[PDB]
Amino acid sequence: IVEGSDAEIGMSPWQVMLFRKSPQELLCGASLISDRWVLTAAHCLLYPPWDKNFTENDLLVRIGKHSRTRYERNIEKISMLEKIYIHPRYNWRENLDRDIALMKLKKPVAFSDYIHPVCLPDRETAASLLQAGYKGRVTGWGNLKETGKGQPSVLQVVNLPIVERPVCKDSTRIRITDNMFCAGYKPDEGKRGDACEGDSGGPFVMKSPFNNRWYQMGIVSWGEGCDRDGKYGFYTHVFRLKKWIQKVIDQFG
Amino acid sequence: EADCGLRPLFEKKSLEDKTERELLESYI
Ligand SMILES: CC(C)[C@H]1NC(=O)CCSSCCNC(=O)[C@H](CNC(=O)c2ccc(Cl)s2)NC(=O)c2cccc(c2)CNC1=O
Ligand code: NA
């Protein structure tokens, strides 16, 4: 996270850390959406160009964390994965279209003050909240800058405005599709911030003023670097792929 | 399930985090 601040305890209890078993290393962000379902970016588990093909046994999912590094006894919970599901039409060859995967824990996890699911949007929430100028929130333990801040001690948080699709498309030469949106301040806007390496797969969330709940509108997917002027962060549009999410849960739950 | 989206240390205890106003003020 660039130009954010430390998250508050249990400020983001759906935050999940994907952790590689060997080496013992943060892999990506993720979110808890049920007692047995974790949501992430597909590129965190499958990207053949970088020889990335994680299977069930290679990672664990750490829930309820605050510190980036410390094992936090009686606060965090680590679960083992039963099955990965990568969107079948995820496009790693071109533009990370449909950058989304679901992970199903072996056993259900106990909700607590530090562990609690975020909501997925329905039509109306999406239709109400997904609008340029409206701000969502991004969290993760990724890098504090693209290139003496480097890596943070604890969960970082930042609030970024959604951006008009034509400004998103003009900011990059990458083909950007309807399964994606972009977010970030414009060079003019005086404020700055973004996700960065290590924040991929984490949630872009918004708080509904209608019902006071937090909804995950997005998954941190990619940007051209981090917090560059004229560049934006790209997120997988969770709503547009909700059918897939429902489909998989409804079949393997 | 039915509980999603409300934070045990925030909503459920009627507390607000430091930067969540920023969000609400942007909808206006
Ligand atoms: C085509 C496009 C989908 C993308 N492809 C890939 O990244 C393939 C490797 S998978 S790893 C992706 C995550 N890491 C990056 O994107 C990294 C760092 N940025 C981030 O992690 C994010 C910043 C804002 C958000 Cl939101 S995420 N990007 C670059 O290195 C980069 C630096 C310069 C240019 C780019 C990325 C251009 N974008 C890409 O290469
Ligand atoms: Na930017």
Which secondary structure elements does this structure contain, and how are they paired or packed?
The complex is a heterodimer of chains A (253) and B (28).
Chain A: E1 5-6, E2 15-20, E3 25-32, E4 37-40, E5 46-47, E6 52-53, E7 59-63, E8 77-79, E9 81-86, E10 101-105, H1 123-129, E11 135-140, E12 156-163, H2 165-170, E13 180-183, E14 203-207, E15 214-223, E16 233-237, H3 242-252
Antiparallel strand pairs in A: 1-12, 2-3, 2-7, 3-4, 4-10, 5-6, 7-8, 9-10, 11-12, 11-14, 12-13, 13-16, 14-15, 15-16
Chain B: H1 20-27
The complex binds the ligand CC(C)[C@H]1NC(=O)CCSSCCNC(=O)[C@H](CNC(=O)c2ccc(Cl)s2)NC(=O)c2cccc(c2)CNC1=O and sodium ion (NA).
Please provide a written account of the structure.
The PDB classes it as hydrolase. The entry lists the keywords serine protease, blood clotting factor. It forms a dimeric assembly. Crystal structure of Thrombin in complex with macrocycle X1vE. The complex is a heterodimer of chains A (253) and B (28). With 253 residues, chain A is mainly beta. Chain A has three helices and 16 strands. In chain A, a hairpin with a 4-residue loop joins strand 5 (46-47) and strand 6 (52-53). Chain A has helices spanning 123-129, 165-170, 242-252; strands spanning 5-6, 15-20, 25-32, 37-40, 46-47, 52-53, 59-63, 77-79, 81-86, 101-105, 135-140, 156-163, 180-183, 203-207, 214-223, 233-237. Chain A has a domain at 15-117 and 242-250: Beta Barrel (Thrombin, subunit H), CATH 2.40.10.10. With 28 residues, chain B is mainly α. Chain B has one helix spanning 20-27. The longest helix of chain B has 8 residues, at 20-27. In chain B, 11% of the residues are buried. Bound molecules: the ligand CC(C)[C@H]1NC(=O)CCSSCCNC(=O)[C@H](CNC(=O)c2ccc(Cl)s2)NC(=O)c2cccc(c2)CNC1=O and sodium ion. Sodium ion (NA) is lined by residues 184, 194, 227-229, 231-232 of chain A.
